[PDB]
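User: Thanks for the earlier help. One more: Penicillin binding protein 2 prime. Can you show the sequence and predicted structure together?

Assistant: Of course, both are below.
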Amino acid sequence: ETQAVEAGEKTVEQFVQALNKGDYNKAAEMTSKKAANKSALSEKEILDKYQNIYGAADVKGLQISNLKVDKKDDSTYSFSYKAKMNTSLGELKDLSYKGTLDRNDGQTTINWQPNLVFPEMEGNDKVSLTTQEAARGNIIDRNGEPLATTGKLKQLGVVPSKLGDGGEKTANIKAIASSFDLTEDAINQAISQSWVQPDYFVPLKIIDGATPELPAGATIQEVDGRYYPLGEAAAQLIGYVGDITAEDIDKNPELSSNGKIGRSGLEMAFDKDLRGTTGGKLSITDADGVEKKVLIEHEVQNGKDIKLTIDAKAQKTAFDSLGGKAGSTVATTPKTGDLLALASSPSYDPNKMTNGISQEDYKAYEENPEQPFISRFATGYAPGSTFKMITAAIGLDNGTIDPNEVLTINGLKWQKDSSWGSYQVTRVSDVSQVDLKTALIYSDNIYMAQETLKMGEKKFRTGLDKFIFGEDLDLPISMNPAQISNEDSFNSDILLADTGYGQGELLINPIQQAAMYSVFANNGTLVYPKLIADKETKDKKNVIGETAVQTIVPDLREVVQDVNGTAHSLSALGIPLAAKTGTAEIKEKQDEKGKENSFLFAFNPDNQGYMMVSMLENKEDDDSATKRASELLQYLNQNYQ
């Protein structure tokens, strides 16, 4: 009729969680009085020992197993268990702890001994901790410009002794809370931490913006931190870093209990390569410091740099050009696949994200219907009517499209026959006589719809299978493979027609679009995009025939040169351009009225030096991808020959 084991097991479990959370006072309180067969130190000494050892090594995730609590005599119970914990030098597994407990007046306490810090420690043994911190690698652009690196950050903090006494301190803390949007409790918790000394500086917040008037006690210090020079302009590509938490540790035991881990983008994708290995040594020594046991010993390894094909100026110009609207712009050197820019708008501040963003500003990002967190350049979209040039090329190669055949088209709408019900393909300009060249110039959907249907699904898919639908691109960016449609067959004349001018169920991301459109700058050879600068160029030959390319390209120049071309506004720039505009019209079940995406494909047809693909999502009034492309084009044309 005994159930004092219940309380026994529980005490050890309460002691351990107390240490797990760093409440060393609480763990000290659960220990027996100091005496020969009880605790070896007063509770204050005990508190201090854990604070100096466990606090310095930043011990977290202390977890036990095999908890056995057997009784030996009336007022004494033995205990033992296995455990692991994580430190600032990594995990510590296979630890065997053992001890006894004192039962008295209902309560049960721990007969503390040094071996409940670390096993085999005895008497006045000590712990030595040395740390060699490893610098996180930098993500740099094609010319070495920094995209993720270390920077000097403005850190607000207070010096307790300079805060005053009694009411004055309370008045100063109030003022700091106002001027910097902080809580009094937050500030007070921070000043109470044990490492703090009267004249020491205690950090409170990273100041991104001008520095307000500083109240007594408050001060700013420039400190090192991860820094993103392009800020939001490359936020989705690069991602951001955050504090390591237990969950990360569970998965990776080599992770330092305190440190930084990438949360998205390349920071995450290359986190192992960028973090390196933290060095140092945790060991037990006797009272004199003579090494007794080595618990952990690592050699420091600085992370390595990751060099991209990105051009930091193109990236910034690409992002800025989207004017804060929903959209994406991708730019490459089509002959090699180098990714010069990967812009997605809107975006988020990666510096605020890494430096402690409020919960409200974080939700406002995630809840924004325009989704600034998504990587639009890695998200599948219907490619729009720019895709007409792909359908055209396929038709020239298989002989179903004669560039000289002139179609008679009346009005802005057309259906094959009344089996289409109320559906009709729509074009923007009412041009009566339309051949391939005229269809490209005017961006005529009806012409291409008619030609696709004439071609038939079998020939059309035979051309499309030569591209990259279904392929997983070799890039450190998460994405789904492009698709023609949801199933293997369209099983619909309408869907077939629609896919020919780029709507229907096509889903291709801007990077994938750029890969496919590279055939016009490589005489029909497809060049796979690359992001890592040292990577070997990869290509696929004969995706489209040389003759198709040679026929379409001079037509694309007219898209710009011809007074009626849809990209004629770009001819005022006076630079060599082959272009194809497009639109995608998608259905609605909430606004009712459909939304329209606007696109621009452009490249230098004289030197094939650069290529761009840009989308303005849900364009308004007279905005277009084309009206925003001039600055990026000017810059690429000057620099990529």
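User: Great, one quick takeaway?

Assistant: The chain is about 30% helix and 25% strand.
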